[PDB]
Symmetry: D2
């Protein structure tokens, strides 16, 4: 199954007490597939509030997402953790469910050496037999991997490439030059145009949950060399993103889902659970200006 | 029970497969009480490899530590997590076991606002009824809290004070000036002396597992104003600490315990699980030079 | 005079004792005009080793460069300094010589407030009557300016826009969206393609002194939407740039000029004055692979 | 001449047009010697607004300060610069004037290598014959030097030691341990007591221009092991420093001088030249509360 193209980092619907809302999660899945027209979903990432949840809740989300999506789209499962044993258990579970690849954040909190990081990736690959996408988010992790270190990771033939979330476009270009057959997915929705200009293979993003029509246009127009039109759409996109960021990233994408009839629910504590009223009204203005 | 003074951040003995070795953990607890002469233990911290473990393994460690220590010393339970529900569970369990206070790292990975951080501490306190020590480790977390924000936290009368792990001695002074009745424990063993000189009430540290004799000397000498002698002992301490850092922090402490007949075991993956033989030889030298 | 397009940040030829070599400086100017075919020169920038020079040497350089260039190309004079009186004197001097615009790095070393920064720019403009390009280099200065702050600066109608040297392509897009009539010059040669893709009006770079042919191709092909060809040329460019960076930035561009008969001379202490022999040999290899 | 103890980093009196006010500079010098009772002055440092001035103005300040001080106190001349030639010129001039040591900030703006930094210090020393104090201000410079690199610097017997301005108390202890006969001056007035507790030999500070009496008490009491009394005075000191930082550092110290009849003048552009009237009223309050 082809892993190129547009992937929404799946948001999860929670109840007021923080439990999974299965019905709302299925609506979010459906909405991405049928209305956003994504190539795939990236499940259990930062956007899914993954790192605030129990092992059992993560399994529950993997199960529901796969069940609802079936085989209509590609699915990637993020299974990384500071706990390698949890990561292996999640990796085997997602592999058994039929996820097309695994993905794993570089281990965080502690300051791990590069050979520890490589051993972590190799252990998950070995225990699962599945493909791996290296998940690079230096602004959250403080972890910075170079071209040579990426080459050492790529010695494992099950490693397909990297979800690139740093804003280093020098490194991005260097990685594409050095490993032309390895894949890169851009992680930053608001920099999609420059990233596609350097030949990334795809994008994984939180805003595609509500703006997937514009995201695909930016990406495909860029790759066809229609820059003038891609740029205009990127501009409107970034007006939307700038508002969503100022209003509260995850809550505001959820409120934009709710405004389209999707039961996207609350956020999970310790994140703020629901918008204040004025921030509800602000989300409505964003809906009216950009998504109507 | 008095929470002032010298607290070892408890190391945990693991088997080759990463399971807890109960017999070893009990030897480590017994050695801190009987040989290091600590005032208490801080259990489930960074030092105990906490964030690489399952919830069940965390509970197991709390239980064992408490069972072995009984009521001879004070015990503090670190129950913080990106998962607030897990933090509440562990907080209730440790409270039922009779830990004298909880502690909790500020939630991490995601970028939480300060009112989220305050709500997180307030929720743990309300659900457990226990005391709370705010756990500040900016070099691992990327989280920086100010004097005013500490004031907001301290509006909850069950918040006793802070485990201070930043090296900002201006902030440390400002906090003691503003909240003279709240407690500060120094978190950096190699800066014990300047921290004690500013009136911190205790220290919580990984190296006190093998250097607890000198740590108590530095701390009590400094508070008595014997700076000349405190400094000499800090100098030797930091020769030892420099060596430990260079050889691998957790593994070298465990090697140093092993050399005194404590079965301190392996470290937990994804950390390197055991020292290479030259690193074992290096640890023997530190032993011969500083702890014989 | 039109300030769009390709500007080399002018390197300066120094003698062994650090004095300016006027014959060499003239050769570097002539080479840029006739062989690199640049639209202009940006004189007195970082690349010119400007900050290691006295006010007299700076004046000497402005006059030689203008005298040699005459009116064949556009010229911009970087006159910024921690000393505002020096910046004014240089700004008047360069204006009198007929430079087409001034430019000034944000004041550095001290932490200036934004209103101090704005006042600095307004003072230089008022004293000289000339146009001003805001010079933004956060990796050298530690200074970060936002979209709103750029808008306050742009209230002065003599401010033309900004030499952008941060790698923040979100900010770059947001600046183009907000102030569509103000100009942006990219400052990072190795990210020229992504920057052009977002509509920048030009580039100012150290490497255009030797690679100005490829630099113009990347820029013009990108603007025409020929991304596939622009990317190939950016790849080869970045092979050259990676080698130049590893070998020593300014020294290696000078050595690559020398290999084309230009007496680009020494660097100025406290920079290392000349390459070691092996680094000379390395620059020869770069010349053979990329510039023959 | 003995270079231990308490040094005010000397403020400079400017007129409304930025020229040096000689009469005012002399009043500041006199006030530090007679009223603050300092062991010496550190002239041409960050506090003296040095880096905003021309070479001639710097010379003028060295000459005036030395003339006014004569031989009553120790004098250190800061002569560092991104321009090594200006550094050598100023170093020779100050040496000829009879300054007891030079000092030079690590070269900044460009990212110099360590061998370049060492060659810079060695050149200044060789051209002047004078002593050198290495001036370490990482929060302004972005430059971080380690224990081994300080040892390489100290191979030059004319390098006396270091003005320490990082808040890294581990590095401070390590430097005293490794080079017990080399001197350290604390750079951070608000961290005086913990620095003195680690055996620093002296302190160089901006606030000693108005709080010299307290600064000497903190330092001498700490060295005598009267920590309880030292801490009280550090507390009051840091209430004053906090106010001064909030209100505007250099302008508020000058306002505090003016309230004692010292004509401390304006600040030099591009710093804000004078306080607003509410900030004047604020400074009067600091004077009433802490310096009456």
């Amino acid at each position: 199954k082809n892993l190129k193209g547009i992937f929404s980092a799946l948001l999860v619907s929670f109840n007021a007490d923080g439990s999974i809302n299965e019905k709302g999660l299925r609506q979010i899945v459906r909405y991405n597939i049928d209305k956003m027209k994504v190539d795939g979903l990236y499940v259990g990432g930062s956007t899914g509030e993954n790192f605030m949840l129990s092992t059992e809740e993560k399994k529950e989300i993997f199960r529901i997402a796969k069940d609802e999506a079936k085989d209509e789209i590609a699915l990637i499962a993020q299974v990384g953790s500071v706990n390698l044993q949890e990561a292996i258990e999640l990796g085997k579970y997602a592999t058994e469910l039929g996820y097309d690849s695994l993905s794993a954040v570089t281990p965080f909190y502690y300051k791990f050496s590069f050979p520890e990081i490589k051993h972590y990736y190799d252990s998950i690959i070995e225990a699962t037999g599945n493909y791996m996408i290296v998940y690079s988010i230096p602004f959250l992790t403080g972890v910075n991997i170079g071209v040579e270190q990426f080459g050492e990771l790529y010695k494992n033939p099950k490693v397909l490439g990297v979800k690139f979330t740093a804003g280093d476009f020098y490194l991005l270009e260097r990685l594409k030059k050095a490993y032309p057959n390895h894949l890169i997915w851009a992680g930053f929705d608001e920099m999609m145009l420059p990233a596609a200009s350097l030949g990334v293979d795809g994008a994984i993003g939180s805003t595609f949950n509500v703006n997937g029509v514009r995201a695909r246009q930016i990406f495909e127009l860029t790759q066809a060399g229609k820059l003038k039109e891609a740029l205009e759409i990127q501009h409107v996109t970034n007006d939307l993103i700038e508002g969503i960021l100022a209003n509260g990233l995850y809550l505001t994408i959820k409120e934009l889902l709710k405004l389209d009839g999707v039961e996207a629910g609350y956020c999970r504590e310790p994140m703020t659970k629901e918008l204040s009223s004025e921030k509800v009204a602000f989300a409505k203005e964003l809906k009216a200006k950009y998504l109507s």
